Symmetry: C5
């Protein structure tokens, strides 16, 4: 097999058509699965099959039929192959169990198919301002390293049909949709122009889970503090312990939520809702202090000279009305 | 040993019977142990022995007896060997201590046995909707990379007897059972058809542990709030602190359970039970508020004009009846 | 040095005495240190020196004295060496700083000493039913990969004296003792019989630490709830808050203990003790509810017609007696 | 391509101009992205493109035009290349997917361009005394390993214009600014002098996030304890539970904050503020004890012989005044 | 450069002076930085420069001046080099970015300088009985692997001046001091005697941080329980809730401290102080139970027949005196 191909009779350190027009190379991609996603480091891991198509007359061999030959990764070190690399990637490797996952198929006229299986991790900027209602977009980029557009031309072989996805791809806490491909030209100041390929998709969260865990407990505790407005003001040993204990219960809820969320160090949409509810509970404690002080002053004044309080009556209306107004404004901005 | 075999006289870059019928290859598998399982990344790790059987007349050597020769991993780089790989795997490697774990045995007539020891990690989709009563199924897949069904034929050498398991295989938090093997054909649009092999097993949890840790504390606290229905309504400084403190105790239990469970971001069966019990505790606090307000109004009305309350009597019956009805419906759906 | 030994004149791909009796190989082991132990994955890491002894007449060289030659790891790739591997191991590697840790010493008559330094991680099944009083046993296994008992014979060179241990070996949370060696034969259905070597040791915990952290706080809280049996029954605002707060304190202790212990998902000995104490605290709360209800009924009955309660007197005796009986049964079973 | 260049006719183990003046080498750097930063281990990870420029007459080839040739990483092992390394680095590696990310361009007159893509992790000393208002500075260093200033001269090719940064570089919890380059000479006692290059940048935090999470809850609880100064002193069952519960609430806040912050084991600016507020809450509990004791003594004295207390009046003024004074001093020192 | 040195004319598999006296080798060490320290696994990571000095007449080359030649890591595989390795090390590696960090300098008369940059992790036994006042000592060991003292002699080239340290070496939570070097002979039963080198240093903690976080909160809570001794005994709804809540507050502090400290599973100095304070709080709760019971009995006895209690008076003196005595004994033992 190494004698039909003129391996030793040709210099394979130079691209086909050296000194002439650029050689076109086609790319096909099949996505196998998505492994994991990190919200702190802002990256994702993908596994895929990568295929290349090009023609090289130096690899032609005589044959009485159209039967193509198949080779392994050992022949790759001798023949010339493209050097595509993934831009903005953090780490990547090629599987080698039980051997290198590389195949080569050579047509009698010199057409070559080159395929390999590779896992790549790529960075992706994310914005958590609208958490947990945020929507994230990611992209993967493929580009030639050493050859500019004047020497190598890169394109999708079959347009938008060149991308295939496994039917079983899924994520534990995200929903994946809208796979499509695009192309663009990249420029480097000290090297020149390059062709670049893109693979795009979108991610979404499960809204209903976060509503039950975070928004639901907060609302109940706020409504629970409104009970004290209906208890008799003369029961000092009852009104005071109820108010302070509700603040303690709210504090533990906020602390627990922060520990479960990722260590994102800036204000998010969920943080605004929780701390506003904390202020409402705090204001209810000061409300009884005014009632107690005024009642004591009035009783002492009558003794020196010798029914529901007005504050309680209005608090029963103002407090529920203010909280509903806050919800309408909050949900109108954050959809 | 390298001269009895015609290593230099044959081209080993081509499969035996090139240009003719497909060469059949048999596979035997022995499972050694299961290392770990991840519920967040949805993958498992397995260690096993992999063996191949095929015939190659080019490796025949003259011998006066049936004594077969044994070689090492150094000879593998010269002779032709199958290229089986594990589909949907994330990472894998071959052990090399103190040397490569590869053996070769060649019969005088050219029959070859090839064995190696390899550890492989494979993905597995899991559903946690019925946690902690869920049951999970996993599979491992073996397939040829470069050779289609027209060139290489893959099958189990001895049918269902080709799979062996160690007697000491176990998991810390799962029960393993139902090992069996199956086969199926896989199709690739741009390459063709391939034979694929499967190894299947099932996993189960320990039910009684989760009942004690999660379901048991929740039931006791709900029954504890029903005590307030039997205390005298005139003891305002006693009824109110009891109600609010029970809500605080329930909140800490729910927070602790979430931290221990894996970060699965959707509603599970256990979450439904815990939050329904929280509502029952919340409703008991509002029940006393109605009793206290009505009692105060009645006393003031009598003074202006100049025994167990009905709500308490019915609450002693309705609340226990409602909770039992919930349990019957809940346990009938989730088995 | 490469010319006194007939490296190029002999075929080193075959074991000495090919076609004849099995070649005996001796093994010496010196344990350097134990690195770590994992209770969730059930494995341990060990570092050791491994030495081999065998005779090969093909490596003899003429010498006027008994001065043996010393070589490095480069000569290993040429001469034949044993292929011992560690069974049931998860991962292992050979150190290479600043170079490969391999030595070779060849006697004039052909005796060869082969030594290397290797770190190996091996699995070990553990049972935590009797935690924290459990005792664990571990073993390490060494076996030849490719050569059966008919071709290679493996044995300890000096019996039980072949195992040496460093004087400074220790673990942070375990006690190591009882190092000894044993041998056994292993059988493989498709390959044959093999000789196997074993290294055994035992591990124990520090009992007194767990008693102070877990058992000590639980006992104090149970005894603390018995105080309410001596307080006047007329102090309703005192008896009720004391009972409910003790339940809250007990709940936080149980939650904290679970977080510190490893994620072992089945019932252990410690879990039984903690939850039984929780029931004792729960029963004390219901005890006062019966006293309060009966007192209220009696007072109302006397009014309609126109001293320590018996329950409190017996509770002072029954509750302390029941808890002591539980301790005697619990400690008699779990030693 | 390997015959136009006199690879076999020259000794490439010696630098160009051996025995003569030092060869000047230029460096260009383009920063791609920052991956992560660790506050416990005090290091950061950076990915960048590194380029070298030098002239070597031994690589000249005849050509009728100015068309330069392009090669791959295979030619690097034959020709002489600079040996730049990153000082104070912990770990680094060169990407190799799908092949080595190395390019070579050779001009007809012998000018050589050498480029590679590398990820490097470097240490950086940090001071957390002024947390969370601290500002950190980092640097990256490049130096030749084996060749001193007498043999190799290292400099920026285009001065301060040699550094380029990606437009999308960002960090999750830090702000990056002030990229600039500097140079300095380094001296080694046993080897000599070396040229060193520097890349500098500055990092800042998000101030407003930490104020809401830490400073905001602490202030509210302190103001909440001042309420007890306005409640009637005769309500013993109300004043005492309010005071002790506030201490409990403050303790949980401090514990939660420590768990979220990195394990920095020395006093920081934030720790001072939290513990001073704890003392203010503690002092309020002792204040009521003095009032209660004095009131009891006065009442007993009057009985034996047969209005707001002064302490409460002053506490309403002294306590708010003292806390405001603390804030002015605290914020004047820590800006 | 490969022809002035007689690489092919000499057998470099044997040490210089084979069959004669031992060859002396000198070592110089410069410490660059300390990366991290682990208190659970008991190991530390260090990065350093290692240099060797020896003479080999086989590498002499003719020269008209004293100009020494410089080489790279490629020549190392041909010439003979020492095989120093780090004893008791867990893992180590040599940096290779952008190339191997190895240099060679050969004098005309055959003197050779060999330098390399390596990162090594070594074990270190630690004792935490006196935490957080403990002091730890660490050591690093260098030894020849294959050559005994009869063939290779190892020594510091310049005595105690051979060790250099970077001015910027620091740790986040430890203080490093007292760098010095020592030497000792090591014996192996089956191999012989070896020379060993040592590098020693000492580590200390920041005392004041742990006092504020652990000792300070514990003392305040104990003093807080002494307040109840000054409140009127007739206020049953005040004395009882104060006592039980203090126990709850103390329990949360102890749980939080354990989570922050490393998982060291034996009794430490800090644990003794915390649990003794817990007993003091527990005893105060039982003290009021005796007062309440005796008061009730006396009142009932007077009714049947028809002022500060003594226990409270003594408790005001005995309790403060006992705690001060404990501190004097505790701090006298643990310095
Ligand atoms: C489509 C095509 O190129 N077919 C070729 C044909 O020219 C040749 O004669 C035959 C061999 O049998 O098959 C092949
Ligand atoms: C079963 C089989 O093929 N046996 C062969 C036999 O033909 C041969 O004569 C003998 C050598 O002694 O053993 C072998
Ligand atoms: C114990 C043994 O085999 N010793 C041999 C001896 O025969 C030989 O004559 C001498 C060389 O001087 O030493 C060696
Ligand atoms: C700027 C420069 O050096 N240009 C050279 C020129 O001398 C030569 O004649 C031409 C080839 O066509 O291009 C190239
Ligand atoms: C100190 C020493 O050995 N120096 C030698 C000297 O003998 C020689 O003549 C000169 C070459 O110019 O320098 C070198
Ligand atoms: C591929 O299909 C997607 C579908 O959204 C479309 O947006 C995109 O433009 C298509 N690409 C090409 C190259 O036609
Ligand atoms: C192997 O045995 C299992 C037992 O469950 C059976 O389901 C399966 O069909 C068998 N496979 C073959 C190939 O007979
Ligand atoms: C080695 O000594 C141990 C000591 O416990 C003993 O049990 C074991 O049998 C001995 N082994 C041999 C091979 O004598
Ligand atoms: C590069 O620009 C920065 C801008 O801050 C300046 O400080 C620095 O000195 C400049 N360097 C040189 C070499 O001019
Ligand atoms: C090196 O100096 C240290 C300083 O503490 C001293 O203890 C040690 O003995 C010295 N070593 C030698 C070899 O002189
Ligand atoms: C008390 C909770 C009130 C919630 C009001 C929600 C209004 C949503 C409008 C879009
Ligand atoms: C108060 C707990 C009642 C539990 C009822 C369980 C019924 C199970 C029916 C299958
Ligand atoms: C209240 C604690 C009683 C403990 C009794 C222990 C008995 C141990 C018998 C072996
Ligand atoms: C009660 C909070 C008072 C805060 C005062 C802040 C003063 C800032 C001066 C720079
Ligand atoms: C209430 C705290 C008393 C502390 C006494 C410390 C004495 C230290 C003597 C060395
Ligand atoms: C499944 C319960 C959702 C509750 C949402 C409450 C939003 C205010
Ligand atoms: C802390 C509450 C003070 C209330 C004062 C009311 C004066 C009208
Ligand atoms: C927040 C409630 C204020 C009510 C004021 C009533 C004045 C008469
Ligand atoms: C081992 C106790 C199990 C309790 C189950 C309770 C289910 C309602
Ligand atoms: C918050 C409880 C209000 C109860 C009102 C009862 C009216 C019948
Ligand atoms: C949830 C209990 C309701 C009881 C209503 C009784 C009306 C007389
Ligand atoms: C929940 C406690 C009820 C007590 C009833 C007692 C009847 C004898
Ligand atoms: C658990 C204590 C029961 C006491 C019953 C006394 C009946 C007179
Ligand atoms: C966004 C609220 C900031 C509050 C700062 C308080 C500083 C005393
Ligand atoms: C613990 C508080 C004691 C208060 C004593 C007051 C003496 C003037
Ligand atoms: C901290 C308040 C002290 C007030 C003292 C008043 C003395 C008359
Ligand atoms: C649990 C406290 C009992 C107190 C009894 C006192 C007898 C003198
Ligand atoms: C721990 C205080 C004991 C006081 C005893 C007093 C006896 C008269
Ligand atoms: N094709 C990417 C690239 C990097 C570089 O330095 N020149 O080109
Ligand atoms: N046999 C698997 C496979 C991948 C590919 O691209 N062609 O075949
Ligand atoms: N010696 C172990 C082994 C594995 C195998 O397949 N045959 O032998
Ligand atoms: N150029 C760095 C270095 C290290 C050394 O030992 N000599 O030089
Ligand atoms: N120099 C260390 C060593 C190990 C061994 O087995 N012989 O020597
Ligand atoms: C926050 C309510 C205060 C009311 C004072 C009249
Ligand atoms: C939730 C019970 C309310 C009863 C009102 C009559
Ligand atoms: C659990 C004790 C109940 C007693 C009822 C008489
Ligand atoms: C801390 C305030 C004490 C006041 C005593 C008169
Ligand atoms: C712990 C104090 C008990 C006192 C009994 C007289």
């Amino acid at each position: 097999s190494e004698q039909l191909l003129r391996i030793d009779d040709h210099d394979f350190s130079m691209r086909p058509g050296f000194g002439g027009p650029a050689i076109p190379v086609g790319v096909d991609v099949q996505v196998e699965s998505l492994d994991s996603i990190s919200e702190v480091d802002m990256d994702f891991t993908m596994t895929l099959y990568l295929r290349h198509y090009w023609k090289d007359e130096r690899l032609s061999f005589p044959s009485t039929n159209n039967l193509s030959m198949t080779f392994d990764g050992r022949l790759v070190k001798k023949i010339w192959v493209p050097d595509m690399f993934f831009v903005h990637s953090k780490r990547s490797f090629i599987h080698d169990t039980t051997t290198d996952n590389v195949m080569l198929r050579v047509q009698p006229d010199g057409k070559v198919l080159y395929s390999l299986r590779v896992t790549v991790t790529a960075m992706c900027n994310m914005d958590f301002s609208r958490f947990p209602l945020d929507t994230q977009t990611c992209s993967l980029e493929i580009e030639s390293y050493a050859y500019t557009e004047d020497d190598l031309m890169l394109y999708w072989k079959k347009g938008n049909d060149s991308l295939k996805t496994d039917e079983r791809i899924s994520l534990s806490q995200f929903l994946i949709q809208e796979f499509h491909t695009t192309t663009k030209l990249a420029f480097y100041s000290s090297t020149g122009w390059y062709n670049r390929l893109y693979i795009n998709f979108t991610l979404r969260r499960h809204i209903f889970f976060f509503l039950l865990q975070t928004y639901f407990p907060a609302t109940l505790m706020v409504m629970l503090s409104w009970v004290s407005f209906w208890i008799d003001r003369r029961a000092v040993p009852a009104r005071v312990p109820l108010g302070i204990t509700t603040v303690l219960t709210m504090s533990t809820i906020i602390t627990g939520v922060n520990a479960s969320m990722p260590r994102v160090s800036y204000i998010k949409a969920v943080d605004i809702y929780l701390w506003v509810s904390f202020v409402f509970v705090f204001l209810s404690v000061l409300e009884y202090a005014a009632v107690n002080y005024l009642t004591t002053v009035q009783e002492r004044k009558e003794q020196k000279l010798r029914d529901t309080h007005a504050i309680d009556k209005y608090s029963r209306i103002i407090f529920p009305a203010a909280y509903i107004l806050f919800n309408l404004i909050y949900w109108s901005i954050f959809s």
